[PDB]
Amino acid sequence: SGFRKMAFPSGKVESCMVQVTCGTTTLNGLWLDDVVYCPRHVICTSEDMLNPNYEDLLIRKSNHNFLVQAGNVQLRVIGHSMQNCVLKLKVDTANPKTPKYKFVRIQPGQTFSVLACYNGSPSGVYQCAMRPNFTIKGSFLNGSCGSVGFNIDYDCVSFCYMHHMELPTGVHAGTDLEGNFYGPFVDRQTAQAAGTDTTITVNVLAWLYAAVINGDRWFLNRFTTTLNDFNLVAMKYNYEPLTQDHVDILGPLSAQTGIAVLDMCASLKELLQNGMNGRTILGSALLEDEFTPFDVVRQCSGVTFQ
Amino acid sequence: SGFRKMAFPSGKVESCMVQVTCGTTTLNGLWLDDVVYCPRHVICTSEDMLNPNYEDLLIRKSNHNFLVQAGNVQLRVIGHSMQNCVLKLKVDTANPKTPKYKFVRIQPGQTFSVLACYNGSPSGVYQCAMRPNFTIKGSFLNGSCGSVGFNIDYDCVSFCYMHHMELPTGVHAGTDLEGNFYGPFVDRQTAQAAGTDTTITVNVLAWLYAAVINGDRWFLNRFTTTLNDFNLVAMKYNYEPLTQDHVDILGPLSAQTGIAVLDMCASLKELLQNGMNGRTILGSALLEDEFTPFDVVRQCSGVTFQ
Ligand SMILES: *C(=N)[C@H](C[C@@H]1CCNC1=O)NC(=O)[C@@H]1[C@@H]2[C@H](CN1C(=O)[C@@H](NC(=O)C(F)(F)F)C(C)(C)C)C2(C)C
Numbered sequence: 001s002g003f004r005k006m007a008f009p010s011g012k013v014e015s016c017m018v019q020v021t022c023g024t025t026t027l028n029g030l031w032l033d034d035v036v037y038c039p040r041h042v043i044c045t046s047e048d049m050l051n052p053n054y055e056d057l058l059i060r061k062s063n064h065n066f067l068v069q070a071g072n073v074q075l076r077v078i079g080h081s082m083q084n085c086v087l088k089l090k091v092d093t094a095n096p097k098t099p100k101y102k103f104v105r106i107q108p109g110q111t112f113s114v115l116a117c118y119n120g121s122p123s124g125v126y127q128c129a130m131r132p133n134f135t136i137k138g139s140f141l142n143g144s145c146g147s148v149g150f151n152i153d154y155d156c157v158s159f160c161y162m163h164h165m166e167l168p169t170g171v172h173a174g175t176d177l178e179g180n181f182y183g184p185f186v187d188r189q190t191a192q193a194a195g196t197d198t199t200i201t202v203n204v205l206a207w208l209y210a211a212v213i214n215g216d217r218w219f220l221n222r223f224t225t226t227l228n229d230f231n232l233v234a235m236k237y238n239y240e241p242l243t244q245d246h247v248d249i250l251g252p253l254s255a256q257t258g259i260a261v262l263d264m265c266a267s268l269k270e271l272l273q274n275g276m277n278g279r280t281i282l283g284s285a286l287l288e289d290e291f292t293p294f295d296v297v298r299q300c301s302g303v304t305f306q
Numbered sequence: 307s308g309f310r311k312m313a314f315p316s317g318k319v320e321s322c323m324v325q326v327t328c329g330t331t332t333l334n335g336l337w338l339d340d341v342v343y344c345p346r347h348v349i350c351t352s353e354d355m356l357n358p359n360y361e362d363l364l365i366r367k368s369n370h371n372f373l374v375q376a377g378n379v380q381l382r383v384i385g386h387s388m389q390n391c392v393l394k395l396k397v398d399t400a401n402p403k404t405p406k407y408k409f410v411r412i413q414p415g416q417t418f419s420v421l422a423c424y425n426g427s428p429s430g431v432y433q434c435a436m437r438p439n440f441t442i443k444g445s446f447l448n449g450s451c452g453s454v455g456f457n458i459d460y461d462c463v464s465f466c467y468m469h470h471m472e473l474p475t476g477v478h479a480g481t482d483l484e485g486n487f488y489g490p491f492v493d494r495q496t497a498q499a500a501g502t503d504t505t506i507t508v509n510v511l512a513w514l515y516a517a518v519i520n521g522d523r524w525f526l527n528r529f530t531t532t533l534n535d536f537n538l539v540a541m542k543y544n545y546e547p548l549t550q551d552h553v554d555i556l557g558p559l560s561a562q563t564g565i566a567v568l569d570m571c572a573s574l575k576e577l578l579q580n581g582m583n584g585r586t587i588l589g590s591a592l593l594e595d596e597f598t599p600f601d602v603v604r605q606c607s608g609v610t611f612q
C-alpha cells in the first residue's frame with residue numbers, strides 16, 4: 001500500500017546525457033545513436049537571446065565550434081542541422097548505451113519523468129504533467145536546458161520533452177524532440193505568459209481511485225450523476241470537461257474497485273461544491289491532478305521496466 | 307525556479323538489482339561486488355512468516371537452493387550467511403557495474419531515494435524520509451522487499467535502507483544494509499504498530515527557506531523568537547525540538563536568504579498557532595517536512611552527480 005509521486009527509473013536516460021558547449025554557452029544534450037539533440041539557443045550569447053536570428057547565428061558556426069563532452073570524452077561533431085527549435089549534431093561515435101527509443105508528442109494531461117541535468121550530469125528526477133496551458137511545473141535553474149522528459153514502456157524510452165525556458169510564476173516550457181514547442185511560446189528572451197491553467201479532471205478521478213484502493217474512502221457518497229450534469233459543475237470550478245474517452249480510460253480502475261465512473265464523478269462533484277472540510281485524501285489537503293489513470297495502475301500493480 | 311520532490315538519479319542502483327528466489331518465494335536482491343544482499347524472509351514459506359525461526363530455516367538450505375537472476379543470467383551461489391535480518395549470498399561473479407558505495411545508518415529526519423523493484427526489475431523511484439517513529443511513507447506491494455533506499459554523493463552511493471514489511475496505516479519498515487531494523491520492529495507476520503509520529507521541524511524550516519528562495523514570502527512576519535520559546539510552541543503541535551545542531555545546519559540557507567534562523571522560527575510559530583488561512587506555500591496546503599536543508603541546497607543550486 002501507499003501512494004507517492006513516482007518517477008520512472010532514470011538509468012537508460014542518464015546514459016544518453018552529454019554537455020554541449022558553443023562559445024561560452026553550455027547546456028545539456030541528448031546523445032542517441034550518432035546524433036546529439038539540444039536546444040538551439042546554445043549558439044546564442046546572452047545578448048543574442050533578447051532577439052535571436054537562429055538561422056543567421058548558425059551560418060557563422062562550423063562543426064568544430066561545438067564542443068560535445070560525454071563524461072571525460074570529447075565527441076567530434078561531423079555535421080549539424082537545425083530542426084525547429086532543436087539542433088542536431090552528428091558525431092563520429094554512436095552512443096553504445098542508446099536504448100530502444102521513440103520521439104513522441106504528448107497531449108495535455110499526460111505525465112512524464114524529467115531528468116534534470118547540469119553540464120551533462122544528472123541532478124535529480126521528478127514526475128511532471130503537461131498542463132492544459134502547455135506548461136509544466138518543473139524545477140529548473142540556469143544551465144538546465146536540454147534536460148529531457150520521458151516515459152518508459154518495458155524497454156522503450158519515449159522522449160516527449162526538451163527543456164527550453166521558464167515563464168512567470170515559475171513554470172516551464174519546452175519542445176518535443178522535433179523542436180516544436182508545446183504551447184504558443186518562442187525561444188526568445190521577451191515578455192511571455194502562459195494562459196489560465198485548468199485542472200485535469202480525468203487525473204483527479206484516477207487519484208480518487210488510488211485513494212479507494214488504499215482504503216481512503218471517506219469522500220465516497222451514495223449518489224450518481226450524468227456526464228452532462230457533472231461537466232456543468234466542473235466548468236464552474238475550472239476543471240476540464242470529462243469526455244467519453246476519459247470514461248473509457250478509467251474503466252480498469254472502475255472495474256477493479258467496483259465503483260462506476262459516474263459514481264466517482266458524483267463524489268468529486270460534492271468535493272468541488274463543499275470542499276474537503278480540512279480533511280486529507282492520501283495525505284494531501286488539495287485534490288491532485290498529476291497522476292494519470294495509467295500512473296495509478298502502474299504504481300498500484302507494480303509494473304516494471306527492462 | 308520551482309520546487310519539486312526530487313529523487314536521486316537511479317541508474318547506479320538499477321545496475322545492482324537482481325531477483326532472488328528460494329523455493330516459491332521471490333524478492334529483490336542488491337548485487338555489489340560478488341555478494342547479493344536480500345531480506346532473510348526469502349527463505350520462508352507463507353506459513354513460516356507467522357513465526358519464523360530464521361536460523362532453523364537456513365540450516366536446511368544449501369547454496370544451490372538459491373536462484374539468483376541478473377537479467378537473463380543466473381548467478382551461481384557459492385556461499386551464504388545471515389547478518390541480522392539480511393542474507394548475504396556469495397556468488398561466483400562480481401557485478402562489473404558495482405558503483406563506489408557505502409553502507410550507512412541514517413538518522414530520523416534524513417531523506418533518501420527508494421528504487422521500488424519487483425522480480426529484480428525497477429518500477430519507479432521516489433523520495434522518502436526516515437520518520438521520527440522509524441517508519442517511512444513509501445509505496446510498496448507484494449514482492450517489493452529487497453528494494454533499497456540510498457543517497458548519492460558525487461560518484462558514491464550510500465545505501466541506507468532495505469525494505470522488509472508494511473505496518474498499519476500503510477507505512478513501511480525495514481533495515482539498514484547490515485540487517486538491523488530501524489525502530490523496534492521484527493520481520494514476523496504478527497500484529498505490530500508504529501508509535502506516534504512527529505513533524506521534522508528542521509525540515510519544515512528548510513522548506514520555508516526554499517519557499518523564500520522561490521519568491522513565496524507571504525508567511526514572513528516581522529518578529530524574532532528565542533530557541534526556547536519556539537520549542538515550547540513546537541512541543542504543543544507535535545513538532546520535534548529544534549537543536550543548536552539544527553540551527554547550524556540551516557546556516558547556509560539562512561545566510562543565502564538573509565533571514566536569521568530564529569526569525570524563520572518566529573514565522574513558523576505563527577503558522578502553527580494560526581494556520582495558513584487556506585493559503586498555499588510552494589503549492590502545498592500543508593507544511594512539508596520531507597526536505598532536509600541539504601535537499602533544498604542541492605535542488606536550488608543544481609548539485610549534480612557522477
Ligand atoms: C536553459 N538553460 C534556461 C533555463 C531557465 C533558466 C532559469 N530557469 C529556467 O528554466 N533557459 C533560459 O534561460 C531561456 C532562454 C532565453 C531566456 N530563457 C528564459 O527562460 C527566460 N524566460 C523568458 O524570457 C520568458 F519570459 F519568455 F519566459 C528567463 C527570464 C531567463 C527565465 C531563451 C533563449 C528563451
Ligand SMILES: *C(=N)[C@H](C[C@@H]1CCNC1=O)NC(=O)[C@@H]1[C@@H]2[C@H](CN1C(=O)[C@@H](NC(=O)C(F)(F)F)C(C)(C)C)C2(C)C
Pocket residue numbers: 001333347350355446447448449450451452469470471472473474478492493494495496497498499
Ligand atoms: C516484501 N516483499 C513484503 C512487502 C509488503 C507486502 C505488502 N506491502 C509491503 O510493504 N513484506 C511482507 O509481506 C512482510 C514479511 C511477512 C509479512 N510482511 C508484512 O509486511 C505484513 N506486515 C505485518 O505483519 C506487520 F503487522 F507486522 F506489519 C503484511 C500484513 C503482509 C503487510 C514478514 C516476513 C514480516
